[PDB]
Design an enzyme around this catalytic site. Structure first.
Site, PDB file in Angstrom:
ATOM      1  N   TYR A  91     -34.467  -7.193  34.954  1.00 21.49           N
ATOM      2  CA  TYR A  91     -35.093  -7.493  36.101  1.00 21.49           C
ATOM      3  C   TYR A  91     -36.432  -7.182  36.181  1.00 21.49           C
ATOM      4  O   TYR A  91     -36.946  -6.091  36.700  1.00 21.49           O
ATOM      5  CB  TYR A  91     -34.179  -7.682  37.480  1.00 21.49           C
ATOM      6  CG  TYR A  91     -34.878  -7.868  38.681  1.00 21.49           C
ATOM      7  CD1 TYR A  91     -35.315  -9.114  38.768  1.00 21.49           C
ATOM      8  CD2 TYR A  91     -34.407  -7.312  40.083  1.00 21.49           C
ATOM      9  CE1 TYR A  91     -35.823  -9.660  39.812  1.00 21.49           C
ATOM     10  CE2 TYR A  91     -34.727  -7.697  41.124  1.00 21.49           C
ATOM     11  CZ  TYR A  91     -35.571  -8.899  41.263  1.00 21.49           C
ATOM     12  OH  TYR A  91     -35.744  -9.581  42.230  1.00 21.49           O
ATOM     13  N   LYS A 121     -34.955 -11.798  33.443  1.00 16.99           N
ATOM     14  CA  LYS A 121     -35.418 -12.361  34.664  1.00 16.99           C
ATOM     15  C   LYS A 121     -36.920 -12.029  34.833  1.00 16.99           C
ATOM     16  O   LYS A 121     -37.371 -10.711  35.141  1.00 16.99           O
ATOM     17  CB  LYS A 121     -34.610 -12.592  35.922  1.00 16.99           C
ATOM     18  CG  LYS A 121     -33.236 -12.977  35.544  1.00 16.99           C
ATOM     19  CD  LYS A 121     -32.334 -12.684  36.980  1.00 16.99           C
ATOM     20  CE  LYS A 121     -31.365 -11.551  36.605  1.00 16.99           C
ATOM     21  NZ  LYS A 121     -31.869 -10.358  36.380  1.00 16.99           N
TER      22      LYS A 121
END
Lengths: 293, 293, 293, 293
Positions: free
Chosen positions: B129, B154
């Site tokens: 992330y 991500k």
């Protein structure tokens, strides 16, 4: 979708513009399919040019093509005004300016007034040259709308929603991305094209990526995008603005002279190492038939 | 390609996770065609939740769907390890962690060690992330390659080439963009999808944009993109993380409770003014048949 | 003027707080002339600590001294409130909080509301812990005036005018600089003292710099300032939060255990290289009679 | 310790250097106790000046005083070399250059070569003009030491440890701070003085703060420092570079003309608004006998 080349300014060893080398470069770019030549931008060392040098670059390139956007900005507005007026004799696409650079903490009122003054005197359509990392200031979609007189914008930033905002808030504006990622900006995402630094030395790639993208050959275009990116990565080893000279001569086969110090030319050993870093890439592009050997 | 929702965490008025409202929200998003739910992300106020609460979020959403990426990160590595191991008995898609936040000038060595530690203990694929703006750190394509154990990333950043870099250097990695510009990241640009915060309150818009883009209907997708961007804009007026609750209640018709202070809720007046700003967007979306009245 | 030590939190190999080492450390610092101890600050890894661990630090140090500023902040305001209320049983100098960290683009109103809420429940004077690089936010003199209830501010920033601004706009506020430059901040320039990172491992140096500076012995003070700056630069080679442990053991002669991962401890080789870089500084401080042989 | 004024360049209404107003200003600054005049600096709109104008500025001020540091830098290194060589016949303090501005990601090698080329041709001592927020690059103490030929540095930055680092790593170098906080930099903290923008319009205040600080009258110095700070804050309302003209005329009593657009002049309304902001400061300064009514 259009590809715009921020064209390199070649200098002689006497640190004057090499008009003949610039003529040759512009010829090759137009013949290889570039749509428009952006003159006196960052890659052409625009801020390193006097007003008269900026004008010389216009004239040199104009002998070859009308497809010109003429960057005229600077920290003396009277000089930028004079260049805008001198351009009336040239049937070109437009003039452009970056925002006033160097000075921190400039008011939006003053920045707006700078651009509106150029609009009021311009004999041509006026393009915003937005480059926040270089100029220290962001003329974003909202400020552009306040200014109200831009025909187009060149948004040299990697923030792709930033670029699309100009289209959203100025529906009749031409919007070009200066992102390194051609594949996602040239075509099919609501923009009018890309101002592509790498098109100086590998215009075949940028043009081929354009075509492939519009034909939905994303896998094929990504492969070239990645090669393009590997060249950019290599250009940063010694300085992209200086490496663009070595890379153009290597991939295109003709000399572009020297940059203007303190954008210092690569020395013979740095050129050797840079060529070594990109020689495999050139072989691949030949095997792929994008470059003739 | 996919749409991943960084799902909101509903809180009660006395600041407890409202599990039944969370489940209702998760069901709605799955019903509207969201592909995966990203739990304990920024939009879900992950960093405001204890490890106990992060696990409770997993347990609530898992009663709705196993299409979960479970964010477990934090500044106590032992707590992250425990959450990873506790996820063993959930048939989910994977776990995720942001980089250690707050502390500046953390060495790359320590950042890499943090992530490799999670991989070594994880019973599921591990997702990076990446959110430089919130964490102060960038775990870019090269660092991710050095870490060497990420199933996917991500990349919550508007810099689209930064995101692509992950795919170029880690060709087996799943790569998702956190960019606001759905139309350039949901399909046909080399990426696997978009983690879309607006998908909490307008999943229909984000899902429909994904379809129109695959179908090459750029004009129609662009119109929805701009409406989505107008809502986003409106949400910044009083604060996006707070406003996302009011917007979801407004556009989807169910209450999501409160955010957790210092992410304070909008008061009655702020709610009314925000609704005022987007009621015309709603009306347009009805006429387009994206939403029902 | 005062020296405030942002005291280290020693952890055990089981990653729990080491109460006895903390007590020993606090004792030595008071004995060496530190004026006050700031608990659960950045150097104490405050954001890595649960609410109960923050309370444990207060309790361990309070056994030694009541000259404590107790940092209680976090992203769960109920937990901060609870800690503020629990401090009532401790006759300390004050409580403190940083601004909410991680989340970007928090509204000024929400930031103000967070701090005013803590002031409302605090049984003690409330101190602003302003650290914009770590938190992403700056609670400047103007916002601090608006909040209205701070007894003091610790401004951890190298920007010295920013720190003086608190004094100019809030003449009754106690104002402490977190700048590395003790000479220009600890005395005779308008401020009330310095929150000094290096004071954990060289408290003798920071106290003596204060004394010399008050005596206007600037040449002597600068020589010590420079030796202090050299230790600071050495501490950053491998990470200053981790190196603080090694440096305290080396210079003060007792062990402070381990940091909490992902603030990972220096490994054996790093410890050896760090000692080699400061062992001559140690020799010089011994020669100068600031440290004991 | 010394005060250096980065002297304003007055322009006529038709955008020509107003030499007679410059001489009058330089005379008054010397008369009021300023030690040296720094010509073609940021405050003097150096980057807005042609090389020919930079020389004309030197020639005007030299008719008044030879305590001149001559800023010559630019993006055409030949012009900088030329200016450096032309300065031979002037008995001045030295020349100065900022770092090459505008272009991002310049290599340290090229930055170093730029400055070493100037040193190799300079008939005078060479000063580093470090202004990272304007130029986009920091030439810190370590690079300064590597360049190895600077006689002095002007560090225009609020990070005071940054400025001290030059003195630590280059003990024979003269080190001036450009920070707004005179009281902590002008005297008694290790530096040789301050380059003070506010000294164009309130030289009396700047020189008196130095005198008080040396006399160790800190409360009196601090009271003037705050008055100085309130003027600087008022100058940010409309833009400091433009407001310096109005403030000089108001506090010193002679006209300094206009700035060069896009540093646009304040219009008559802005001038009146700004004067209303500072007229209480003026009367206070008359009461304190710093200024004559």
């Amino acid at each position: 979708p259009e590809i715009i080349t921020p064209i390199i300014t070649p200098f002689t060893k006497d640190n004057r513009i090499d008009k003949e080398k610039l003529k040759i470069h512009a010829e090759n770019l137009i013949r290889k399919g570039i749509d428009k030549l952006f003159v006196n931008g960052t890659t052409g060392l625009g801020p390193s040019l006097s007003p008269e040098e900026k004008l010389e670059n216009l004239k040199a390139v104009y002998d070859v093509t009308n497809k010109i956007i003429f960057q005229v900005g600077g920290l003396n507005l009277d000089d930028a005004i004079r260049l805008a007026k001198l351009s009336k004799d040239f049937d070109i696409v437009g003039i452009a300016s970056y925002a006033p650079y160097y000075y921190p903490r400039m008011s939006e009122k003053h920045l707006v007034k700078y651009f509106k003054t150029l609009c009021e005197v311009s004999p041509h359509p006026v393009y915003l040259y937005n480059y926040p990392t270089a100029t220290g200031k962001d003329i974003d979609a909202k400020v552009a709308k306040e200014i109200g007189c831009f025909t187009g914008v060149k948004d040299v930033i990697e923030n792709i929603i930033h670029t699309l905002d100009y289209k959203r808030l100025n529906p009749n504006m031409l919007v070009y991305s200066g992102s390194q990622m051609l594949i996602a900006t040239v075509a099919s995402t609501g923009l009018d094209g890309n101002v592509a630094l790498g098109s100086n030395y590998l215009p075949e790639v940028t043009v081929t990526i354009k075509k492939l993208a519009m034909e939905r050959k994303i896998d094929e275009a990504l492969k070239l995008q990645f090669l393009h990116d590997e060249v950019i990565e290599a250009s940063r080893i010694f300085g992209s603005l200086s490496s663009n000279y070595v890379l153009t001569k290597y991939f295109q086969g003709y000399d572009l002279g020297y940059p203007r110090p303190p954008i210092f030319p690569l020395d013979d050993e740095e050129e050797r190492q840079l060529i070594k870093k990109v020689e495999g890439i050139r072989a691949k592009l030949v095997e792929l038939k994008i470059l003739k050997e």
